[PDB]
């Protein structure tokens, strides 16, 4: 028969997906080429590139700034920003503080159409006479693209930086034995997804199998 | 008659076992884990599934 | 009937027959040990009307576990030619039984060398590890056993 | 093979103060006996050592 | 492991006592047919058949549950044996 | 998964700046997870190359291949940056997530071995 | 070779000679002699601990054979050689915990 | 394998990382060929392995060859016994053996 | 900088054997293409084979037969060799018979012809009969997928028929490549080989297009959510 699919949902950040019976080996079958998928494919956003005013390179440190720069890139790298137009393929976000103030995401300049999921995720402490002026790049793709491989730069002094696009930063599945009657050896297939918010995992699941669906269709015209 | 045991008795037994466990043994019963308890999970086979921890 | 399906004229299970656990392989009677029907046996009796037989159901089944195809009967009377039983014994029924045993999970296998396990999982051919022309193999050894 | 090679001379040595009288026929096997001892716990460490620097 | 052993082992001088406890209690549920039980409607152990869920049958799984909600009191003494049985048959008859 | 690369090739050289290191590397002079000293501190070229903001983020690289498990690099974990493999940190993760205790988690393993 | 000799349970032909007849029951070869010789063949006999004893022909009506030229398999045995199991294509790795 | 270079196909993808891993290893000689490495690799019995379930290789090669394994006397089929109640001994009243 | 669909290459020899290729493809995408459909070809592809065979004056698998050189039980083990085409996809069921006499060595091709049916490997040695050697039977060949053994299903068309273990699955063998390809500005894409070998009762072309229907109607199974 029809398998039964189950989902249980915390929030935007967390699902968990049963689908169960299925004939003896499938739940691998499906469960392997969906994980590879949701890891590599879908659709996200990252920030590849960092310019900040008086730092020549990643190793420097800023004076009258707590964090060095290898800090400060990290956090770029937890920032979660969401792209209301679907054609908007880049972006460059701007940020100058200064003084005794925590910089948090929210700081940064309103720009249209782009969504900051997590506003209030941390990115520097400023000290008194401490002045950060930078400009990130945030860009539209997919998987992990480390700096050194993309190697992209506005200006000189510009720092690249690891892209992480993913929105999805696990995926978890397990198969285990289960029975219909006489038959026990069909399968039980509980797929787990952690996105980061912007991509929900139920969306992000759908997309996987879309992209799987789209592929079986490439055995068509020879 | 094993020919006139029908699908439903196996479903009923599950409902027998439920929540209930059995004790294995291994010889030489050298000390007391020699015997240990056990929830029983039903299995097509003829071999008792042990579990790896246990062993030792 | 469907108890006695398999049997002959005389008892015996046809040969070719497959016999499983519980199933008769020999029918046999045997005279009731003289005893009283107890009084609950007595209205029983009395309440569907039918006489206690005088033979009790002795026949050899097969054991729990066992069982094949019936491939010989062996039959030995007495007072038939070329045979004479122990004194007392009227006849003798022997039943060969077969079974072709496929390879199954708890069963022992060994190399030459004293490397020696039991059978814990059969593996569909597209789990088991392959080479790259396409190639399963046919048993997975663990290094530790070494 | 080094510490083969350096054995054997060693043993040779040990066959040279004998057959001078020198230690009997027990000290002679005591000290062969030794020797190996000590040859085998050598080669035991260059294994692990072979093992941990170039494959470990 | 059973779920919150560790409290039960908690509740007693010596683990035999905890078996006790609850062998006892799984008897009293048993005898009564569970309606002497003090869980709640939400609270009862379930068991999945192929209808759907049912009351888990397993008197010791219900004993452990009862015992962990802190509705039970057990000791030594508490009640004459008789005068325990009689009352439990007049609130919940067999 | 916890045992960490030992590699030949960088042998201990002194490296002013991490950059210089990385080009060094880079041109294939010097191993990833091979000792080294940059300016004066001896760290691996892997942990300079690869900085990681969290967990996560490590193993999605694992994940394309970018490292290995048993690769010694950055990552930034519970407020700590710390130098280890992927590995040593799917272990610690392990751990953390069976006991549903992160902190008591991280106090339990010895992570550096 | 020898072992599966030794045991008897293979069958071999006493003298040069051709084959006369080949059954799953017997085999019948022409000597020298000229004299006619017909081995039965023990088909699917248990043994003392039940496993089955059976002869299988490894000739073919027709053939010529020399003095002890395999007549029939005996058990366990492949033309000739002891044969207690088979040779399969083996993985030595860990695998699940199976 | 020269049979699949004349079929017209080259070494996989999960060959090299196979082979990357199998140089850390100290199994094949760095600088040579991928052929050149997995003919190193087969003289010590070892070989590249695909995991069915994944499809990934097993990340280091694997020893694989023909085995001779006998199946023993001792079956399952033979040994498999249970009782609930059933005979017991004439003097001691307890189950048999 | 979006990938888009492939070319899809189709190369044929008889119906045995097909190679399936699709380039260029996103990197990593040759596996997870590749796989599912490897272990969906080698499991879940229908198929026939012989399920029952019924032998004149044989009671069971471990007799023998006057004449027949081989017993029973090697002949049911050459019947599993035995493959068989059916040309009318509405047809589940054959029964084939076979009557053999004489100093011949019986082979497939002795088999009954039956209509819309095809014998694969008419070569397949059967039986080595000698004189007085009389060989009757009727094999039953039916449709079904996997692996099937004599024990589960025990089909019986008569009181003396003898089960056969069934392989059901028309694939011999999978596999597949996965070697570098570049669109020219960019690298690390995969190129897609799929090598299929058959029994030739389907052929590897028509394997694999079942096996992508199989994989895909299962990702419809994502659908209803609860
Ligand atoms: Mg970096």
Same mark, same amino acid.
């Given at each position: 028969?029809?398998?039964?699919?189950?989902?249980?949902?915390?929030?935007?950040?967390?699902?968990?997906?049963?689908?169960?019976?299925?004939?003896?080996?499938?739940?691998?079958?499906?469960?392997?080429?969906?994980?590879?998928?949701?890891?590599?494919?879908?659709?996200?956003?990252?920030?590849?590139?960092?310019?900040?005013?008086?730092?020549?390179?990643?190793?420097?440190?800023?004076?009258?700034?707590?964090?060095?720069?290898?800090?400060?890139?990290?956090?770029?790298?937890?920032?979660?920003?969401?792209?209301?137009?679907?054609?908007?393929?880049?972006?460059?976000?701007?940020?100058?503080?200064?003084?005794?103030?925590?910089?948090?995401?929210?700081?940064?300049?309103?720009?249209?159409?782009?969504?900051?999921?997590?506003?209030?995720?941390?990115?520097?402490?400023?000290?008194?006479?401490?002045?950060?002026?930078?400009?990130?790049?945030?860009?539209?793709?997919?998987?992990?693209?480390?700096?050194?491989?993309?190697?992209?730069?506005?200006?000189?002094?510009?720092?690249?930086?690891?892209?992480?696009?993913?929105?999805?930063?696990?995926?978890?599945?397990?198969?285990?034995?289960?029975?219909?009657?006489?038959?026990?050896?069909?399968?039980?297939?509980?797929?787990?997804?952690?996105?980061?918010?912007?991509?929900?995992?139920?969306?992000?699941?759908?997309?996987?199998?879309?992209?799987?669906?789209?592929?079986?269709?490439?055995?068509?015209?020879? | 008659?094993?020919?006139?045991?029908?699908?439903?008795?196996?479903?009923?037994?599950?409902?027998?076992?439920?929540?209930?466990?059995?004790?294995?043994?291994?010889?030489?019963?050298?000390?007391?884990?020699?015997?240990?308890?056990?929830?029983?999970?039903?299995?097509?086979?003829?071999?008792?599934?042990?579990?790896?921890?246990?062993?030792? | 009937?469907?108890?006695?399906?398999?049997?002959?004229?005389?008892?015996?299970?046809?040969?070719?027959?497959?016999?499983?656990?519980?199933?008769?392989?020999?029918?046999?009677?045997?005279?009731?040990?003289?005893?009283?029907?107890?009084?609950?046996?007595?209205?029983?009796?009395?309440?569907?009307?039918?006489?206690?037989?005088?033979?009790?159901?002795?026949?050899?089944?097969?054991?729990?576990?066992?069982?094949?195809?019936?491939?010989?009967?062996?039959?030995?009377?007495?007072?038939?030619?070329?045979?004479?039983?122990?004194?007392?014994?009227?006849?003798?029924?022997?039943?060969?039984?077969?079974?072709?045993?496929?390879?199954?999970?708890?069963?022992?296998?060994?190399?030459?060398?004293?490397?020696?396990?039991?059978?814990?999982?059969?593996?569909?051919?597209?789990?088991?590890?392959?080479?790259?022309?396409?190639?399963?193999?046919?048993?997975?050894?663990?290094?530790?056993?070494? | 093979?080094?510490?083969?090679?350096?054995?054997?001379?060693?043993?040779?040595?040990?066959?040279?103060?004998?057959?001078?009288?020198?230690?009997?026929?027990?000290?002679?096997?005591?000290?062969?006996?030794?020797?190996?001892?000590?040859?085998?716990?050598?080669?035991?460490?260059?294994?692990?050592?072979?093992?941990?620097?170039?494959?470990? | 492991?059973?779920?919150?052993?560790?409290?039960?082992?908690?509740?007693?001088?010596?683990?035999?006592?905890?078996?006790?406890?609850?062998?006892?209690?799984?008897?009293?549920?048993?005898?009564?047919?569970?309606?002497?039980?003090?869980?709640?409607?939400?609270?009862?152990?379930?068991?999945?058949?192929?209808?759907?869920?049912?009351?888990?049958?397993?008197?010791?799984?219900?004993?452990?549950?009862?015992?962990?909600?802190?509705?039970?009191?057990?000791?030594?003494?508490?009640?004459?044996?008789?005068?325990?049985?009689?009352?439990?048959?007049?609130?919940?008859?067999? | 998964?916890?045992?960490?690369?030992?590699?030949?090739?960088?042998?201990?050289?002194?490296?002013?700046?991490?950059?210089?290191?990385?080009?060094?590397?880079?041109?294939?002079?010097?191993?990833?997870?091979?000792?080294?000293?940059?300016?004066?501190?001896?760290?691996?070229?892997?942990?300079?190359?690869?900085?990681?903001?969290?967990?996560?983020?490590?193993?999605?690289?694992?994940?394309?291949?970018?490292?290995?498990?048993?690769?010694?690099?950055?990552?930034?974990?519970?407020?700590?940056?710390?130098?280890?493999?992927?590995?040593?940190?799917?272990?610690?993760?392990?751990?953390?997530?069976?006991?549903?205790?992160?902190?008591?988690?991280?106090?339990?393993?010895?992570?550096?071995? | 070779?020898?072992?599966?000799?030794? =045991?008897?349970?293979?069958?071999?032909?006493?003298?040069?000679?051709?084959?006369?007849?080949?059954?799953?029951?017997?085999?019948?070869?022409?000597?020298?002699?000229?004299?006619?010789?017909?081995?039965?063949?023990?088909?699917?006999?248990? =043994?003392?601990?039940?496993?089955?004893?059976?002869?299988?022909?490894?000739?073919?009506?027709?053939?010529?054979?020399?003095?002890?030229?395999?007549?029939?398999?005996?058990?366990? =045995?492949?033309?000739?050689?002891?044969?207690?199991?088979?040779?399969?294509?083996?993985?030595?790795?860990?695998?699940?915990?199976? | 394998?020269?049979?699949?270079?004349?079929?017209?196909?080259?070494?996989?993808?999960?060959?090299?990382?196979?082979?990357?891993?199998?140089?850390?290893?100290?199994?094949?000689?760095?600088?040579?060929?991928?052929?050149?490495?997995?003919?190193?690799?087969?003289?010590?019995?070892?070989?590249?392995?695909?995991?069915?379930?994944?499809?990934?290789?097993?990340?280091?090669?694997?020893?694989?060859?023909?085995?001779?394994?006998?199946?023993?006397?001792?079956?399952?089929?033979?040994?498999?016994?249970?009782?609930?109640?059933?005979?017991?001994?004439?003097?001691?009243?307890?189950?048999?053996?």
């Amino acid at each position: 028969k029809a398998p039964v699919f189950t989902v249980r949902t915390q929030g935007r950040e967390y699902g968990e997906f049963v689908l169960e019976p299925l004939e003896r080996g499938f739940g691998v079958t499906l469960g392997n080429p969906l994980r590879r998928i949701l890891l590599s494919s879908i659709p996200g956003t990252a920030v590849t590139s960092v310019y900040i005013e008086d730092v020549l390179h990643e190793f420097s440190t800023i004076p009258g700034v707590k964090e060095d720069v290898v800090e400060i890139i990290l956090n770029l790298k937890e920032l979660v920003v969401r792209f209301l137009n679907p054609s908007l393929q880049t972006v460059t976000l701007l940020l100058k503080a200064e003084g005794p103030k925590e910089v948090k995401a929210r700081d940064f300049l309103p720009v249209a159409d782009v969504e900051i999921m997590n506003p209030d995720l941390h990115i520097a402490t400023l000290e008194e006479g401490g002045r950060l002026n930078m400009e990130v790049r945030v860009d539209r793709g997919v998987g992990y693209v480390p700096a050194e491989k993309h190697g992209i730069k506005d200006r000189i002094n510009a720092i690249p930086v690891d892209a992480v696009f993913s929105p999805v930063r696990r995926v978890a599945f397990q198969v285990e034995d289960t029975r219909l009657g006489q038959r026990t050896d069909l399968d039980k297939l509980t797929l787990r997804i952690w996105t980061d918010g912007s991509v929900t995992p139920l969306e992000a699941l759908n997309q996987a199998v879309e992209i799987l669906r789209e592929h079986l269709t490439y055995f068509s015209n020879p | 008659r094993q020919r006139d045991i029908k699908d439903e008795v196996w479903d009923a037994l599950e409902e027998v076992i439920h929540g209930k466990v059995v004790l294995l043994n291994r010889a030489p019963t050298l000390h007391r884990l020699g015997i240990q308890a056990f929830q029983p999970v039903l299995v097509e086979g003829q071999s008792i599934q042990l579990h790896p921890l246990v062993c030792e | 009937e469907a108890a006695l399906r398999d049997l002959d004229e005389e008892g015996v299970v046809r040969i070719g027959a497959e016999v499983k656990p519980g199933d008769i392989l020999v029918g046999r009677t045997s005279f009731k040990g003289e005893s009283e029907p107890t009084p609950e046996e007595r209205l029983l009796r009395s309440i569907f009307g039918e006489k206690a037989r005088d033979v009790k159901d002795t026949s050899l089944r097969v054991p729990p576990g066992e069982g094949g195809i019936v491939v010989r009967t062996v039959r030995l009377r007495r007072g038939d030619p070329g045979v004479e039983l122990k004194p007392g014994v009227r006849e003798v029924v022997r039943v060969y039984v077969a079974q072709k045993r496929k390879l199954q999970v708890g069963d022992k296998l060994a190399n030459r060398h004293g490397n020696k396990g039991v059978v814990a999982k059969i593996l569909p051919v597209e789990d088991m590890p392959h080479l790259p022309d396409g190639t399963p193999v046919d048993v997975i050894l663990n290094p530790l056993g070494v | 093979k080094q510490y083969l090679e350096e054995a054997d001379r060693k043993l040779l040595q040990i066959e040279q103060a004998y057959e001078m009288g020198f230690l009997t026929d027990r000290e002679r096997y005591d000290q062969i006996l030794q020797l190996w001892t000590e040859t085998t716990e050598k080669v035991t460490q260059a294994v692990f050592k072979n093992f941990e620097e170039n494959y470990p | 492991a059973e779920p919150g052993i560790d409290k039960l082992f908690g509740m007693v001088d010596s683990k035999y006592r905890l078996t006790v406890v609850v062998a006892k209690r799984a008897q009293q549920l048993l005898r009564h047919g569970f309606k002497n039980t003090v869980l709640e409607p939400e609270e009862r152990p379930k068991m999945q058949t192929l209808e759907g869920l049912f009351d888990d049958p397993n008197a010791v799984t219900w004993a452990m549950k009862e015992l962990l909600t802190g509705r039970l009191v057990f000791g030594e003494n508490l009640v004459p044996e008789d005068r325990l049985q009689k009352e439990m048959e007049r609130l919940y008859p067999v | 998964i916890t045992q960490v690369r030992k590699e030949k090739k960088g042998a201990g050289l002194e490296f002013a700046t991490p950059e210089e290191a990385l080009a060094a590397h880079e041109r294939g002079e010097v191993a990833l997870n091979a000792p080294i000293k940059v300016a004066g501190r001896e760290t691996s070229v892997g942990r300079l190359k690869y900085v990681f903001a969290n967990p996560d983020e490590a193993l999605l690289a694992v994940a394309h291949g970018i490292v290995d498990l048993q690769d010694v690099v950055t990552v930034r974990y519970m407020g700590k940056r710390l130098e280890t493999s992927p590995g040593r940190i799917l272990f610690a993760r392990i751990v953390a997530e069976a006991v549903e205790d992160e902190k008591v988690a991280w106090e339990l393993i010895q992570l550096d071995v | 070779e020898r072992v599966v000799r030794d =045991s008897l349970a293979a069958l071999y032909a006493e003298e040069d000679g051709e084959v006369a007849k080949v059954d799953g029951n017997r085999i019948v070869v022409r000597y020298e002699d000229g004299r006619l010789v017909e081995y039965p063949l023990r088909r699917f006999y248990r =043994s003392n601990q039940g496993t089955a004893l059976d002869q299988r022909p490894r000739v073919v009506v027709g053939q010529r054979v020399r003095k002890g030229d395999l007549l029939a398999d005996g058990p366990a =045995s492949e033309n000739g050689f002891l044969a207690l199991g088979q040779n399969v294509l083996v993985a030595i790795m860990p695998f699940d915990g199976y | 394998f020269g049979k699949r270079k004349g079929e017209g196909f080259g070494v996989d993808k999960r060959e090299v990382e196979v082979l990357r891993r199998a140089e850390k290893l100290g199994l094949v000689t760095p600088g040579k060929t991928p052929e050149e490495q997995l003919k190193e690799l087969f003289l010590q019995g070892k070989v590249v392995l695909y995991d069915g379930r994944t499809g990934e290789p097993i990340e280091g090669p694997i020893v694989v060859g023909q085995m001779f394994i006998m199946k023993l006397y001792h079956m399952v089929e033979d040994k498999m016994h249970a009782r609930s109640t059933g005979p017991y001994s004439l003097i001691t009243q307890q189950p048999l053996g």
